[PDB]
Structures are given as structure tokens and as C-alpha cells.
């Protein structure tokens, strides 16, 4: 209905609770492997944030996998920063990580992160 | 780090995608039964929105259940309105449903919904 009222903080409160579940390893259903590193997560959050994960977990075979191995060229710290951003809306973008963050965001298909990385690089030229 | 940047719309975009997955029945992992009615959902979203579901799915036995039956006194339309609110931040509160919505929100332990229901009732007195 068009007669709805809206709770402004609801979406951010939901994301805060999803991040608390992730931190406590509650109902995490996939391990993302990035070279030597493993990251536990919720497939629905990954799909909701990334075009690559959306494609992976809507596949009729890959939806059932409990482990996903990323391309060996993917930087684990870049992935970690992006996983934190997925669960918090906060991106720890720094001079020392921007190239890895941008390359990882391009691979994961996260257009808004790619956009801000491009803008921060262009400003330093 | 305290040097993070934040994407304002991220949390709402995540919730919109979780609702699209729910609508298409993608990776839904629980059926909530409310009398004759069945509602498919994601346990993590339910826990993130409701004190009752948070308690249920953190229980070492109940976390594994694929079906949860609610108390027979719970109104299915009241539950439907609250499930939509969980996935959208929008509450379809109307004169004809407010009593059922408030009672359901008290049972599910959704304090902000209970608060607005109380305020709307008090205004009509």
C-alpha cells in the first residue's frame, strides 16, 4: 500500500545485526577462499552486494557450494576491506590499498566502490 | 579504521536486494507457519529484525529447523505486514489492522513497531 510509514534506521539496524551474526559466526553458510585466506559469510549478503556473488549463488549448481575459491590474482586484504564494506557500508580506502581495493571491486562487480576508487585515483594525478 | 568513507544508500540497497531474493524464493531457508498460512523467509533477516527470531535461530536445536510454527493466536495478516516491514522498512499500518499488528510485534519483539502502534492508538483516544 501507498499508506505505509517508514522507520528511517531500519535498513542500517538490519545490516548492523547481520554484521554481528557474521562476527559471531552465526548461520554463516559459505567460506570464501582468497589464496591462503578464508572468510566466513552469509551468501544472501554477498549476493545483495556483489554482481559476481549474485551470479554465483543463483547458479543451480553453485548455489549449493559451501566453499568458493576466488581467482588467485585477488588480494586477500582487498577482499577483507570489501567484505567489511558489504556488512557495514564503510570502506577503509587508503593510499596503500586503493589499487587492490579497486581491482577486487571490479572483479566482484561493486560499481559504487569502483566509482569512488576511480575518483580518488584521478584526484591524485 | 577511523579513516573510512561511507556509502549512504548501501544499507537500503542491501535490504532491497534481500527483499528481491525473498520475492523470487532465492536461498530462503525457513517457512514460518501462522495458522493456515505459510511464509518463506531468510533466517538471518528474521533474526536481524525480531527478538523472538533472534532467540529461536541462536538455539542449538531450533537453528536447524526448516519450519517454525507460531502461536495460533497470531494473526496471519499481522505477520505478513511485519514480514514486509522487516524486508522494506515500510509498515502498512491501518485502522483495520493496528491491533493485530501491535499484538504480533509484541510477540515477535519488534520494539519500534510496538512504539508507533502505541502512539497511533493513543492519538485516536
Amino acid at each position: 500500500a501507498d499508506s505505509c510509514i517508514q522507520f528511517t534506521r531500519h535498513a542500517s539496524d538490519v545490516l548492523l545485526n547481520l554484521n554481528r551474526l557474521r562476527s559471531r559466526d552465526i548461520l554463516t553458510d559459505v567460506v570464501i577462499v582468497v589464496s591462503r585466506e578464508q572468510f566466513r559469510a552469509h551468501k544472501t549478503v554477498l549476493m545483495a552486494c556483489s554482481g559476481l556473488f549474485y551470479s554465483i549463488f543463483t547458479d543451480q549448481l553453485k548455489c549449493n557450494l559451501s566453499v568458493i575459491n576466488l581467482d588467485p590474482e585477488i588480494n586477500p586484504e582487498g577482499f577483507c576491506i570489501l567484505l567489511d564494506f558489504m556488512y557495514t557500508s564503510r570502506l577503509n580506502l587508503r593510499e596503500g590499498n586503493i589499487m587492490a581495493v579497486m581491482a577486487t571491486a571490479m572483479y566482484l562487480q561493486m560499481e559504487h566502490v569502483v566509482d569512488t576508487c576511480r575518483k580518488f585515483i584521478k584526484a591524485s594525478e | 579504521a577511523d579513516s573510512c568513507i561511507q556509502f549512504t544508500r548501501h544499507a537500503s540497497d542491501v535490504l532491497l536486494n534481500l527483499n528481491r531474493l525473498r520475492s523470487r524464493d532465492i536461498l530462503t531457508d525457513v517457512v514460518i507457519v501462522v495458522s493456515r498460512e505459510q511464509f518463506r523467509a531468510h533466517k538471518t533477516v528474521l533474526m536481524a529484525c525480531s527478538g523472538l527470531f533472534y532467540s529461536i535461530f541462536t538455539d542449538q536445536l531450533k537453528c536447524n529447523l526448516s519450519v517454525i510454527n507460531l502461536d495460533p493466536e497470531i494473526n496471519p495478516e499481522g505477520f505478513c505486514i511485519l514480514l514486509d516491514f522487516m524486508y522494506t522498512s515500510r509498515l502498512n499500518l491501518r485502522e483495520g489492522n493496528i491491533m493485530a499488528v501491535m499484538a504480533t510485534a509484541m510477540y515477535l519483539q519488534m520494539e519500534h513497531v510496538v512504539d508507533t502502534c502505541r502512539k497511533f492508538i493513543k492519538a485516536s483516544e
Binding site: 510509514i5 522507520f7 528511517t8 | 519500534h112
Partner: peptide, 5 residues
Amino acid sequence: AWVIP
């Protein structure tokens, strides 16, 4: 919080 969206 609550608002008219």
C-alpha cells in the same frame, strides 16, 4: 524515527 516515505 518514523516518517512518511
